[PDB]
């Protein structure tokens, strides 16, 4: 369980905030953890401590035992679950279906496909003319900006992907070990 | 109760997302035999 303790030192570092992390530090020792002791030791607000505990309960990071005295032990499957969710976002938002360079008319900010301006394509000018106004078309640009969001995300998602892939290899080294 | 539903065997109050994910897994034959046509 020492490895899980170590993975825990990383995740608290990697994710939880000081208020959470200070409480999570106490969770380090899985020998005995009462509610009165943890309250007095942390000197956190009782309502607020109950909120954090309730939050940790939501993680299933703590298994309450009715000794009434209580005990709190690890039940969080979110680290691997969250890494899988990261892989799922990496795979859907980041991908761009096509170049999608539809003509767009700068005067009326109307959006066209390469197909839309093809019917418009004006053979006397060797270029593409907008529909109701003969002003020349432009790149898709702001219109239909799936790529504009994806291009920024594409790169943001790849950085997050190297960091999370390192975290996932550490998790597999722990998860494979315990079979 | 009012706009919420409780459940004791530990008296939880059910979430719409939870019961929604529960429903998301019923196959198309038991849902059919309980009446709800899946199409």
């Amino acid at each position: 369980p020492a490895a899980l303790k170590r993975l825990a030192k990383y995740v608290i570092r990697g994710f939880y905030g000081i208020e959470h992390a200070l409480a999570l530090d106490i969770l380090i020792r899985n020998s005995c953890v009462k509610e009165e002791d943890m309250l007095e030791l942390l000197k956190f607000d009782r309502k607020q401590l109950r909120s954090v505990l309730n939050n940790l309960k939501g993680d299933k990071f703590i298994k309450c035992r009715m000794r009434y005295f209580i005990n709190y032990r690890t039940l969080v499957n979110v680290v691997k679950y969250k890494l899988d969710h990261m892989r799922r976002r990496i795979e859907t938002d980041e991908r761009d279906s096509t170049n999608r360079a539809s003509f767009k008319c700068p005067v009326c900010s109307s959006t066209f496909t390469d197909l839309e301006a093809n019917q418009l394509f004006d053979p006397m000018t060797g270029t593409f003319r907008c529909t109701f106004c003969h002003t020349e078309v432009e790149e898709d640009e702001s219109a239909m900006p799936k790529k504009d969001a994806r291009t920024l995300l594409a790169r943001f998602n790849e950085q997050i992907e190297p960091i999370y892939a390192l975290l996932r290899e550490t998790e597999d080294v722990n998860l494979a070990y315990e079979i | 109760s009012g706009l919420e539903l409780y459940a004791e065997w530990k008296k939880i109050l059910l979430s719409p997302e939870r019961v929604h994910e529960i429903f998301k897994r019923i196959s198309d034959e038991e849902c059919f035999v309980l009446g709800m046509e899946p199409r």
């Binding site: 892989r87 992907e161 892939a165 290899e169 | -």
Partner: protein, 171 residues
């Protein structure tokens, strides 16, 4: 199946040990997920060194060195020609020097100028595509056929040995 991991769309080799890698003209790496993710975004643009892929040249094999893939494919395309056996030469030193010339041509097509190599290929390929290259294509086809026949003869003999000892026991 446990290599460092796919470059572009890094998921395949780390999770699934059920893949194979395809090399390009410049010869680095591409998996099937790379193949499809690359074809939808250019179809013939190398992930790193941007080599100008002629007709989307890609070749799927199962090795984990790119120079190995390069040497295997080029070695096959060279040894389709240059088929003079030891039967075809008068002496032994000429045959061993001929195999060393084949190694020279493979290493020249690895990194050197491909012009003098192709002129040497023109001369030898013409002068021996007259007679010897097609003849040895025929002979290598005959030996492939007879090796497959001999392996099927071995397996018929093993099945007969199994079934005859079973019929010994039951009889």
């Amino acid at each position: 199946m446990d290599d460092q991991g796919c470059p572009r769309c890094k998921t395949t080799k780390y999770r699934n040990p059920s893949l194979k890698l395809m090399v390009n003209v410049c010869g680095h790496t591409l998996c099937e997920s790379c193949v499809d993710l690359l074809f939808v975004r250019g179809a013939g643009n190398c992930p790193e060194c941007g080599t100008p892929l002629r007709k989307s040249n890609f070749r799927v094999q199962l090795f984990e060195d790119p120079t190995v893939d390069k040497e295997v494919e080029i070695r096959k395309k060279v040894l389709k020609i240059y088929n003079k056996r030891e039967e075809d030469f008068p002496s032994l030193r000429e045959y061993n020097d001929f195999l060393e010339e084949v190694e020279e041509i493979v290493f020249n097509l690895t990194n050197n100028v491909d012009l003098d190599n192709t002129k040497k290929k023109m001369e030898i390929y013409q002068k021996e595509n007259k007679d010897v290259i097609q003849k040895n294509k025929l002979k290598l086809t005959r030996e492939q056929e007879e090796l497959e026949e001999a392996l099927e003869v071995e397996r018929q003999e093993n099945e007969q040995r199994r079934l005859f000892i079973q019929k010994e026991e039951q009889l």
